[PDB]
Amino acid sequence: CDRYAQPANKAEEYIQKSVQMQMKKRSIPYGVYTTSCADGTVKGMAENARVAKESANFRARQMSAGAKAAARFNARRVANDWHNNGCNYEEKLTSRFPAAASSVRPTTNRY
Amino acid sequence: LGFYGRKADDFMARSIAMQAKASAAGSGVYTTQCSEGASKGMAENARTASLAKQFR
Amino acid sequence: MLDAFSRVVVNSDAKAAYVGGSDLQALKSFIADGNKRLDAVNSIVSNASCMVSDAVSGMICENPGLISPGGNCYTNRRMAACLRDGEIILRYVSYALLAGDASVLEDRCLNGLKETYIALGVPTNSSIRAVSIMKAQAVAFITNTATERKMSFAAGDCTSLASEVASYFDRVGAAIS
Amino acid sequence: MLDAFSRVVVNSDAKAAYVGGSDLQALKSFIADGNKRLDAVNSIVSNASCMVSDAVSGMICENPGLISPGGNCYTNRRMAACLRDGEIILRYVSYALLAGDASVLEDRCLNGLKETYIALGVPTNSSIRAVSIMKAQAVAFITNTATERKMSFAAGDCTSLASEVASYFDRVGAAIS
Amino acid sequence: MLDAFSRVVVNSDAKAAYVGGSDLQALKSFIADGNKRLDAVNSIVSNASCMVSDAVSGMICENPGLISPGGNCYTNRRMAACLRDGEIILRYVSYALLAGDASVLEDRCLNGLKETYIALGVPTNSSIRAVSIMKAQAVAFITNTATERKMSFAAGDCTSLASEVASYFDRVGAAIS
Amino acid sequence: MKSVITTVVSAADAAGRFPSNSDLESIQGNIQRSAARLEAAEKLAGNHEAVVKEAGDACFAKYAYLKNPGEAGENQEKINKCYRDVDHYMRLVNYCLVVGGTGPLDEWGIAGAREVYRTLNLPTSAYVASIAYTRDRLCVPRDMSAQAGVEFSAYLDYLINALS
Amino acid sequence: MKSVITTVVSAADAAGRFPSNSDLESIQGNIQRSAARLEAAEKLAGNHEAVVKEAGDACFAKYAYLKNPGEAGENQEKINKCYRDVDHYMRLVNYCLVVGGTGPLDEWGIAGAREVYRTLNLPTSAYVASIAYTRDRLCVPRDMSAQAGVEFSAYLDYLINALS
Amino acid sequence: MKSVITTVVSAADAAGRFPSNSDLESIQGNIQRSAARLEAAEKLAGNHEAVVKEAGDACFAKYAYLKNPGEAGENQEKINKCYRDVDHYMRLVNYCLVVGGTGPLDEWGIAGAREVYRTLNLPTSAYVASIAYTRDRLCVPRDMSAQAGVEFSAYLDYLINALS
Amino acid sequence: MKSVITTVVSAADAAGRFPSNSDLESIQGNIQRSAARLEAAEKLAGNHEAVVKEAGDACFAKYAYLKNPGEAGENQEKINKCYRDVDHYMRLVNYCLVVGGTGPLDEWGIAGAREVYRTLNLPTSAYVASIAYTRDRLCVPRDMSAQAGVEFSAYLDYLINALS
Numbered sequence A: 001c002d003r004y005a006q007p008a009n010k011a012e013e014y015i016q017k018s019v020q021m022q023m024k025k026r027s028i029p030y031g032v033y034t035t036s037c038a039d040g041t042v043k044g045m046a047e048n049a050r051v052a053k054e055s056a057n058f059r060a061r062q063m064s065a066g067a068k069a070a071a072r073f074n075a076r077r078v079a080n081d082w083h084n085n086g087c088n089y090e091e092k093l094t095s096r097f098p099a100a101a102s103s104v105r106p107t108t109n110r111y
Numbered sequence B: 001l002g003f004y005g006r007k008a009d010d011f012m013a014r015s016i017a018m019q020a021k022a023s024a025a026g027s028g029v030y031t032t033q034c035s036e037g038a039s040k041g042m043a044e045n046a047r048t049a050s051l052a053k054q055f056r
Numbered sequence C, D, E: 001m002l003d004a005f006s007r008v009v010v011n012s013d014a015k016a017a018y019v020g021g022s023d024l025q026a027l028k029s030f031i032a033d034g035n036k037r038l039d040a041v042n043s044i045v046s047n048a049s050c051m052v053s054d055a056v057s058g059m060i061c062e063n064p065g066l067i068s069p070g071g072n073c074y075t076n077r078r079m080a081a082c083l084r085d086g087e088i089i090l091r092y093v094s095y096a097l098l099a100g101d102a103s104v105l106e107d108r109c110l111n112g113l114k115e116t117y118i119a120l121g122v123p124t125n126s127s128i129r130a131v132s133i134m135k136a137q138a139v140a141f142i143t144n145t146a147t148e149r150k151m152s153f154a155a156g157d158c159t160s161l162a163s164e165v166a167s168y169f170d171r172v173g174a175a176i177s
Numbered sequence F, G, H, I: 001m002k003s004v005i006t007t008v009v010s011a012a013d014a015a016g017r018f019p020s021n022s023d024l025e026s027i028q029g030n031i032q033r034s035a036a037r038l039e040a041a042e043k044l045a046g047n048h049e050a051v052v053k054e055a056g057d058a059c060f061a062k063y064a065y066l067k068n069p070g071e072a073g074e075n076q077e078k079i080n081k082c083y084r085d086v087d088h089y090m091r092l093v094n095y096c097l098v099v100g101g102t103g104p105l106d107e108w109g110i111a112g113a114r115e116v117y118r119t120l121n122l123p124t125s126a127y128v129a130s131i132a133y134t135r136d137r138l139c140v141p142r143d144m145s146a147q148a149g150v151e152f153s154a155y156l157d158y159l160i161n162a163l164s
Ligand SMILES: C=CC1=C(C)[C@@H](Cc2[nH]c(/C=C3N=C(/C=C4/NC(=O)[C@H](C)[C@H]4CC)C(C)=C/3CCC(=O)O)c(CCC(=O)O)c2C)NC1=O
Pocket: F043, F044, F046, F047, F050, F051, F137, F138, F139, F140, F142, F143
């Protein structure tokens, strides 16, 4: 999933960041912001949604050493087999960068 | 696809989620990848995040 | 996601119409009251804590049937959700009086809102009561006709925007009925 | 979710009833029969692999129409879901026997469960037969009237839990009817 | 993950050994001390917002370097992020005493805790100062040497818990350093 | 809700699992100290009209600014609603001595308290300090038993803790 | 849709937030240059039959290969549909002078234009170059005001930019 | 791991939430019946060489087919490993009387037991029935206390239940 | 009685016709209905001690003038006489859920009763509060099965059409 597989270097997190930008571009297809990344209604939950992920971003690199090692083999188990079939370039992008291929989120849930 | 089919449909997917909440807690841990809050309690505030997602 | 500058556009597209000067004087009077609408909506967002304050105050003033336990609206987490639901209509019609148009209401809360309320046991007769308090203070806030709070203004007619906010909250009041 | 310590407060919260010692003594019998209540629930979780092999074998003993192919319950994956559905109803009544209350049965199992079975095609009559074997062996397990299996106990009357477990299994049966 | 019950079974696991009648007399102190351990843990969790407001004020007592603008901890969300981090040492050092072991403390916060703080620019000297305030107020709450707060107790020693809680805040002080 | 029934019969369902003896053990601690917990409940049921009035103007002594127009206590109609407001907090704390945990507090009177009060220009600092007046207002071998005040006093400073 | 209303009332909903003065400021720039924007709209409403015909065979001068059978312009029935096709582009650009942004362009006449045309063997190179004929076809102090052409001309080279 | 510490300090982290009094209540049931739980542990520590030998040929009485070549018990070298195999089950059940739940069972000796045994042609039916010999092999007021056997016997039929 | 089966028997005697499958139709229609109908028909014999001190005095909570001279509570043995007419009027409700029709009542209860009660001068508008408490205390998916308390209402307020 997102925010659970930790990147190793600056190079992995940057293309992890860049594939998230197209998932912004999917859910924000044009100049209107969608109704579905609204993540809040009141002033209290506006900044609560920001500090919720930053504790969960820490709990990726906090929890273990082998389950997060199993994540980087698991990240090819969603992308290689049912997201980028036929593209070898997009296949070795997973096996060279699993944490970048883990927030690619092609389950179009408009988020 | 039916009123009877519509009220059927949310029950097994609740059971699909409770199947899959029981693979997260295969071993009996609420495992740390699932997070649904902050430091301050605010999961009743993140109830209103998720019930907005229930509503939107 | 639709406004007063886009409402007259989509009605030209049932008829493929090139918009010339026959209708734009209604739009040239919409750009006349741009700052007048902006002086109106600056007075609404001035005391937007006070508008949600006065609504559920005067709604529990008339009906203690909610505050009786075993009823709906007796308790504070419910009144949290009630003052979640209270401000959101005020937060959404402030987008609408900004727009000169009620289309931004018409999908962001106005879909599904009446039958979600019957799924939780929400009495809709209190909802049409509290929006009437919300209607009555807001027309007394776009003008200079509050009790104590008089902002500084250039004076003149503000009843055209008062007809717009009066046509907004009853459309809420018909969609919650 | 909700239990016998919390059953006596939700009728008292609905009347704003400050709880005093007029209804405490029914809970004080539940206080005094704490260890008697746990005495029945450890004879029912200690043979739960026996009962799931006793009931649907006893259900296929009485009616061989399901193992006929083209019937409901005949093949190998199909029998895996028979032990799947059959064990999970024993998990929920063992929750319900402990609370002094079948409320935790009523929400996690007993919502919509009946017509999911006929949106599948489960015969509901065979599920009344399987739950009645599970009613009849479990009342023989909370006492000492089993065939071979006698655990060590402290003697006396314990029919008050046998009336409790018989008022639970028909609540399963009336839900799937 | 693992209480002070179970420190003595994972080393017997490594020898293919079992917990014979020589190692668990400290455990038969540890089960006979069930209600003296319980009489310390109400005294910490009753005044939990005292101790996070006594630590961060005593930290800004000794150090006006963070209150300067451009420092670590001076502004609004930032000091709000302190009361996130100020309680979470107190949050898991409760469970270090509740379980009896700091193994519930060792994986759940102490993994990667020091390297995030240099990645967030947090100075570790103010972190190890504020936890020494949290040690000094917790040993005066499990005992009877507070200023004004006088809870009811039964007399006897609990210096065995005072040495257990002193071996806990040093362990988090070695892991944030 | 929130009790030990909400812990162990929910975690066994969250594990998809039997009520094993971890779950059967957790309710035994109810039984040995329900007698400790439930002579505290009829104290504030016996004083359900006694200590609401002594807490309001103890709060309004240290918050005496409210009586001006334009604030939270501008007339007696506010103060007629204000003794309703402390009693509605006081109803729930009585019920948490019965269910064991803070069951009726969080889902009814605690969650989203920080979205209501100063939006209705009600001061939250007077709300915890009216409760903190009643927090130290106890005398453990004299009013109730010594086994009764430690459930009472731990819920009242929790009310300041849950507003934090 | 696509306007400044689609920016700030949607971003305040995407933040779950009030219409603060960041949102109230963004529509003030509509008001001071709607008079700049809306004498351009009645030009191409006044020339809605004038410049459709002058753009078709200016395109068909530099794309004169179409008249053979088996291509996109094999008969006059194609050319009767072809003046419909440039005018349907020309309808939307008139509407984007009214809504401010390119509102009716992207959700109606731009998105998925690169899944249609050469699949229907229609040349996309003639589509941008018929528009690029009309892009430079302006004269800013003579046809309209000087404050009117810079909204017009920035939308026409956008039509080549949005097909890229 | 698997205990009540694995329930409530993990669910408060899964809610992103304080250790509230729902979490503080759940461990009180450890304290009142750890004395019930931990005179059972030194029984099978005192009988860690006594009941391994009495369970092997009680299993090998009702599974006496193994001694042929080509099967799971073709020599004494298998039987020298076989008393290791029941004792390695017997080590973990002793540890689950200490941690409360079935902590050392599931993550070490239960999960993926149904991917190993008949792949190594080891019969799983003899594995549960060697354990089911020891399941009824108890006498609650005579061997241990009456408060000690109900943690022991509920873990042994669980071993047949977890292989199901 | 007017039962589920007894309708088509006299209809077979009316024309000289036979039982067809439409005469056989509603016997399935009761056995598809009564999978939970006998739960509340058992619970009318299963809750009949708390409800005789609920519904026997639910008349007396509203009709407080029954201790007037000239009424049913001037003497103590006539306070028994209204209580058996809740005790028989929950044993006949126990007898009315099982027939299908109003079988006990149209032979014994309604049989002349509009003539009966005003010459003995017993108020039949005071008999409704013995039945009205059995119409609002009904929370169906906690007391009975969820279908079963809907049909239990329908026999119960048909008596209200007889008295009023
Ligand atoms: C549930 C909360 C609750 C309360 C707090 C009381 C509130 C209360 N407490 C006291 C009872 C009191 N009793 C004492 C005596 C004491 N002797 C000592 O050695 C101690 C220092 C001190 C224990 C506080 C004091 C100081 C008061 C408060 C002052 C007063 O008498 O009103 C009284 C006066 C009448 C009486 O004595 O009972 C009242 C109305 N009632 C309630 O229902």
